[PDB]
Amino acid sequence: RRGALIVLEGVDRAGKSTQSRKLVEALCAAGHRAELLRFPERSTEIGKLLSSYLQKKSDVEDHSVHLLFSANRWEQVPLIKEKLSQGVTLVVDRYAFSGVAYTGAKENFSLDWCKQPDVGLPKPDLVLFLQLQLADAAKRGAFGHERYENGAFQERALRCFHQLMKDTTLNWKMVDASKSIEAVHEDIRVLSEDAIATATEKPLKELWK
Amino acid sequence: RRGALIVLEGVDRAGKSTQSRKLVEALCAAGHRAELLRFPERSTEIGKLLSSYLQKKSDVEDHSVHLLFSANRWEQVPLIKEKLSQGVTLVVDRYAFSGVAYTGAKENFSLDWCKQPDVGLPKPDLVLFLQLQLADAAKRGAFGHERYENGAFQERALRCFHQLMKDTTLNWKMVDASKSIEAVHEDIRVLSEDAIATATEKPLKELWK
Numbered sequence: 001r002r003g004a005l006i007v008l009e010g011v012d013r014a015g016k017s018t019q020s021r022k023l024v025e026a027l028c029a030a031g032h033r034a035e036l037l038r039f040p041e042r043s044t045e046i047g048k049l050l051s052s053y054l055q056k057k058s059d060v061e062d063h064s065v066h067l068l069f070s071a072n073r074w075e076q077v078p079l080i081k082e083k084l085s086q087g088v089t090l091v092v093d094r095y096a097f098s099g100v101a102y103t104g105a106k107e108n109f110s111l112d113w114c115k116q117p118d119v120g121l122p123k124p125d126l127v128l129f130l131q132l133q134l135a136d137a138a139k140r141g142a143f144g145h146e147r148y149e150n151g152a153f154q155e156r157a158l159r160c161f162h163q164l165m166k167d168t169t170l171n172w173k174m175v176d177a178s179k180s181i182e183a184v185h186e187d188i189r190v191l192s193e194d195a196i197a198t199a200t201e202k203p204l205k206e207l208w209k
Numbered sequence: 210r211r212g213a214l215i216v217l218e219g220v221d222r223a224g225k226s227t228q229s230r231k232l233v234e235a236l237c238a239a240g241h242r243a244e245l246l247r248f249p250e251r252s253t254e255i256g257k258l259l260s261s262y263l264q265k266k267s268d269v270e271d272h273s274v275h276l277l278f279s280a281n282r283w284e285q286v287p288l289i290k291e292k293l294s295q296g297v298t299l300v301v302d303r304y305a306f307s308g309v310a311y312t313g314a315k316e317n318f319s320l321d322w323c324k325q326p327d328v329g330l331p332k333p334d335l336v337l338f339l340q341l342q343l344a345d346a347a348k349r350g351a352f353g354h355e356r357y358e359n360g361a362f363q364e365r366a367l368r369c370f371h372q373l374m375k376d377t378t379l380n381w382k383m384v385d386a387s388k389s390i391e392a393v394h395e396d397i398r399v400l401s402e403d404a405i406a407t408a409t410e411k412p413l414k415e416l417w418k
């Protein structure tokens with residue numbers, strides 16, 4: 001019985017990391033085998049290049065950094081496929097959607113071009129979008145100093161997420177991320193249990209393919 | 210008057226590196242501003258990952274290594290564009306074609322998927338293909354121990370090069386690489402002088418785009 005591939009997506013400060021951590025804790029406590037992953041995975045050689053770019057410690061040509069982001073997912077594919085086939089549900093904080101939305105916020109990068117490198121990745125059984133007004137997210141403290149952490153860029157990424165959400169090939173679910181941490185968590189947990197139960201019924205597919 | 214972007218392509222031991230070096234020497238001696246580039250460029254952080262992969266000192270997931278190869282070209286684009294606009298002709302040993310042909314020799318990698326990351330690179334004004342029978346190339350000493358340096362893989366790459374050569378969007382020119390070093394060089398030099406003279410007449414375009 002394979003595990004489910006669950007992705008959380010959303011703009012800066014939407015609550016993705018908090019909710020991913022909580023979701024894995026809850027599934028494990030409910031007797032599910034669940035593990036947490038995140039992208040970018042900053043521990044590999046590629047992830048270190050990405051981390052330095054994000055921390056503004058290095059500048060990286062925009063097409064190159066986009067391909068590094070995708071390569072950072074592809075290096076985890078053999079692990080992702082093996083875990084799911086063993087019955088483990090994987091909760092992923094950001095995936096190929098953040099990859100397209102953020103590079104897509106830069107001038108002159110088509111959505112078609114940004115998707116391609118990620119064409120063929122494991123397709124998620126469930127993609128939660130943690131929806132909240134950029135104004136409310138801005139209240140969640142201040143912006144970090146990482147690249148992309150400013151209002152104008154986030155607004156452009158958000159518009160790109162909105163385009164991606166027209167692909168009905170994916171099981172997208174809107175989550176009202178403006179609620180409390182517990183309330184948001186319960187919404188996400190219920191949706192996740194439903195997805196786990198159906199994932200055991202259909203083979204893992206390929207994204208954008 | 211911009212410089213020309215000239216690429217040499219071909220299978221293992223076709224003579225690309227020898228002919229690229231000689232071609233730059235000859236153009237410079239003929240009063241042209243010409244410089245030599247190569248891919249992969251193993252000096253950058255990405256290039257070091259590629260070099261270690263090629264030397265079999267590390268294994269890299271096949272989609273990831275493909276995206277690294279393309280990212281390795283994109284990081285040199287700002288330099289490539291600046292040099293050409295200044296009047297410098299760039300002689301490149303391998304480019305996006307080797308990127309598609311070699312990953313395309315692996316099972317289950319479509320040519321369409323391998324091209325995408327490289328869509329939008331500076332399009333070469335001239336792509337020389339150093340044609341020679343794998344049997345004759347095999348006489349040029351023995352295979353190195355780098356990845357891909359075996360008969361079966363080279364035969365598959367060669368077939369992929371043949372597919373790419375059906376894209377009439379590019380100025381492909383076949384070179385009989387089986388001749389002597391000097392004879393091959395003269396063929397390549399003449400073709401290059403012609404390309405330099407016309408490149409000053411049309412803007413640099415975008416590959417596969």
Ligand SMILES: Nc1ncnc2c1ncn2[C@@H]1O[C@H](COP(=O)(O)OP(=O)(O)NP(=O)(O)O)[C@@H](O)[C@H]1O
Pocket residue numbers: 010011012013014015016017018019140141177178179180181182184
């Ligand atoms: N439901 C919530 N209500 C209020 N504050 C929240 C809520 N969820 C998260 N926050 C807080 O706001 C900050 C952002 O939360 P977090 O889950 O880390 O965001 P994120 O979406 O992963 N951000 P990023 O990684 O920068 O895109 C943290 O300090 C959280 O405690």
Ligand SMILES: Nc1ncnc2c1ncn2[C@@H]1O[C@H](COP(=O)(O)OP(=O)(O)NP(=O)(O)O)[C@@H](O)[C@H]1O
Pocket residue numbers: 219220221222223224225226227228349350386387388389390391393
């Ligand atoms: N025209 C030629 N006739 C005979 N031997 C040649 C010729 N050109 C190159 N070689 C020799 O064969 C070897 C391969 O040449 P080289 O130009 O380095 O190949 P290459 O195509 O760049 N190979 P690779 O980088 O491995 O794909 C070298 O030792 C060259 O001296």
Ligand SMILES: Cc1cn([C@H]2C[C@H](O)[C@@H](COP(=O)(O)O)O2)c(=O)[nH]c1=O
Pocket residue numbers: 012039040054069070093094095096098099100102103147148
């Ligand atoms: C996964 C991924 C994230 N990003 C961004 C979103 C964030 O700004 C940044 C760090 O992510 P975080 O907010 O989850 O820590 O990287 C891309 O630009 N491309 C990608 O492929």
Ligand SMILES: Cc1cn([C@H]2C[C@H](O)[C@@H](COP(=O)(O)O)O2)c(=O)[nH]c1=O
Pocket residue numbers: 221248249263278279302303304305307308309311312356357
């Ligand atoms: C430029 C490039 C080369 N290659 C290969 C061709 C050679 O096997 C190898 C090293 O190149 P070389 O023969 O020019 O030294 O890298 C790819 O697999 N992808 C690419 O994008």
Ligand SMILES: [Mg+2]
Pocket residue numbers: 016017018093
């Ligand atoms: Mg986070």
Ligand SMILES: [Mg+2]
Pocket residue numbers: 225226227302
């Ligand atoms: Mg060579």
Ligand SMILES: [Mg+2]
Pocket residue numbers: none
């Ligand atoms: Mg296409």
